[PDB]
A paper describes a structure:
Although A3GCTD overcomes the solubility problem of the full-length protein and retains activity, DNA binding is weak and does not form a stable DNA-protein complex required for structural analysis. To address the problem of weak DNA binding, we designed a novel A3GCTD fusion to protection of telomeres protein 1 (Pot1) from Schizosaccharomyces pombe that serves as an anchor for the DNA (experimental schematic shown in Fig 1A). Using the Pot1A3GCTD fusion construct, we obtained a crystal structure of A3GCTD bound to an adenine nucleotide at 2.9 Å resolution. The structure was determined in a P43 space group with four independent copies of the protein in the asymmetric unit of the crystal. In the crystal, the ssDNA stretches from a Pot1 protein of one fusion complex to the A3G of the adjacent fusion complex. The rest of the ssDNA was disordered with clear electron density for only one nucleotide, adenine, located next to the catalytic site of A3GCTD. In this sequence, the nucleotide preceding the deaminated C is referred to as the -1 nucleotide and the adenine following the deaminated C is the +1 nucleotide. Although we intended to crystallize the A3GCTD bound to its entire hotspot region as described in Fig 1A, we instead captured the A3GCTD bound to a dA in the -1 pocket, which originates from the ssDNA bound to a neighboring Pot1 molecule. In our structure, the adenosine is stabilized by a network of hydrogen bonds and stacking interactions in the -1 pocket. The backbone of residues P210 and I314 hydrogen bond with the amine group of the adenine, while Y315 hydrogen bonds with the phosphate group of the DNA backbone. The adenine base is further stabilized in the pocket through stacking interactions with W211, W285, and Y315. Instead, the A3GCTD -1 pocket accommodates the adenine base by flipping D316 180 degrees away from the nucleotide, which opens the -1 pocket to allow for adenine to bind.
Apolipoprotein B mRNA-editing enzyme-catalytic polypeptide-like 3G (APOBEC3G or A3G) is a human host restriction factor that inhibits human immunodeficiency virus type 1 (HIV-1), murine leukemia virus, and equine infectious anemia virus primarily through its deoxycytidine deaminase activity on the viral minus-strand DNA (-ssDNA). A3G inhibits viral replication by preferentially deaminating dC to dU in the viral -ssDNA during reverse transcription. Specific “hotspot” sequences of DNA are targeted for deamination, with the highest preference for the 5’-CCCA sequence (where the deaminated C is underlined) in the case of A3G.
Numbering used by the authors: 30 to 247, 256 to 381
Write the structure that this text describes.
DNA sequence: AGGTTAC
């Protein structure tokens, strides 16, 4: 549902027609008034101008999936006579809906300038650690939105965070990645992924193109991982190989979706390293085979991987990886158990 | 004089 919205340039939500940020970053000679809806990648507090009409101004940089991960976004200057009605943004990551913004050149970069009537709507950084990233906004310019643009805003937020959050809490890593064959009460799947580009006949090792994520209650971590893939701006000619590192092997249902991903993407290879083998003693074993037979490459995490995930996806803050007793022992029986699965 | 001010 979200992939195709951002392609044509214009997409509608509620009753308002939005223009993507990438498409907005181009220009015509004349000024054209668009609706925007994105993430605050950076902003500057509302200070009063020192020149010209001296109106109050706040600065935002909106981003959306049509811009790459590393892209800062569209420069937008929001102006107002009173100024005490401009959006009060508290931190980077807030979803932002802007209504009636003019698009023009300034010394060859595209900026947005606010119309007089410009209105807005803000949302908290949902995937932040705080609740109160969103404080009570000034009433004059504020817009009453519903649940429909709730989905959209949260979606953009979720994709943003799942591109600007590599680091994880160290006690979390210990507990979830404990590779003892049967454990309680992990319940959730933690998934740490790498991306590798094809250049010079060998994988270009991508440190900044990494990420990790954890599931919701009751979708799955495997599905949430697949959602950020289309929003990677992947070169269609270049072949890519994903290696994700999971805490639990994917269930039967997510193994099917990860298999149907290999069928949909002809330039993407999928390689899975898991810490435990999830066996529901139902169709989970078949799911490993089905994903396997679809082209995907699965194996058990060994000491090499456990060190690497601690060197990459954890906020060790200087502590080297401290292994638990029986890590190699459990990874051996599991390597036997995995080998037995692909045989049946 | 809609795009100066912000830059
Ligand atoms: Zn699953």
């Amino acid at each position: 549902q979200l992939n195709e919205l951002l392609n044509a340039g214009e997409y509608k939500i509620g009753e308002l027609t939005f223009q993507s940020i990438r498409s907005s970053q181009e220009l015509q000679k004349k000024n054209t008034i668009v609706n925007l809806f994105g993430i605050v990648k950076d902003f500057t507090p509302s200070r009063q101008s020192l020149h010209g009409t001296k109106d109050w101004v706040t600065t935002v940089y909106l981003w959306d999936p049509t811009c790459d991960t590393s892209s800062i976004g569209l420069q937008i200057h929001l102006f107002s006579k009173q100024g005490n009605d401009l959006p009060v943004i508290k931190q980077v990551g807030q979803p932002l809906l802007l209504h009636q913004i003019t698009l023009r050149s300034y010394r060859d970069r595209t900026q947005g300038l606010s119309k007089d009537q410009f209105r807005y709507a803000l949302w908290p950084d949902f995937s932040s650690n705080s609740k109160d990233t969103l404080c009570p906004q000034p009433m004059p310019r504020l817009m009453k939105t519903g649940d429909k643009e709730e989905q959209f805003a949260l979606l953009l937020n979720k994709i943003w965070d799942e591109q600007t959050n590599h680091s994880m809490d160290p006690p979390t890593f210990t507990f979830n990645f404990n590779n003892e064959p049967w454990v309680r009460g992990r319940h959730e799947t933690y998934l740490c992924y790498e991306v590798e580009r094809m250049h010079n006949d060998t994988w270009v090792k991508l440190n900044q193109r990494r990420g990790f994520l954890a599931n919701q209650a009751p979708r799955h971590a495997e599905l949430c991982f697949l959602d950020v893939i289309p929003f990677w701006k992947l070169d269609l000619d270049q072949d890519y190989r994903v290696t994700c590192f999971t805490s639990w092997s994917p269930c039967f249902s997510c193994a099917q979706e990860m298999a149907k991903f290999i069928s949909k993407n002809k330039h993407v290879s999928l390689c899975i390293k898991t810490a435990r083998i999830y066996d529901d003693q139902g169709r989970a074993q078949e799911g490993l085979r089905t994903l396997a037979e679809a082209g995907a490459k699965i194996s058990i995490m060994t000491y090499s991987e456990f060190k690497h995930c601690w060197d990459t996806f954890v906020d060790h803050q200087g502590a080297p990886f401290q292994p638990w007793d029986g890590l190699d022992e459990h990874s051996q029986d599991l390597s036997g158990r995995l080998r037995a699965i692909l045989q049946n």
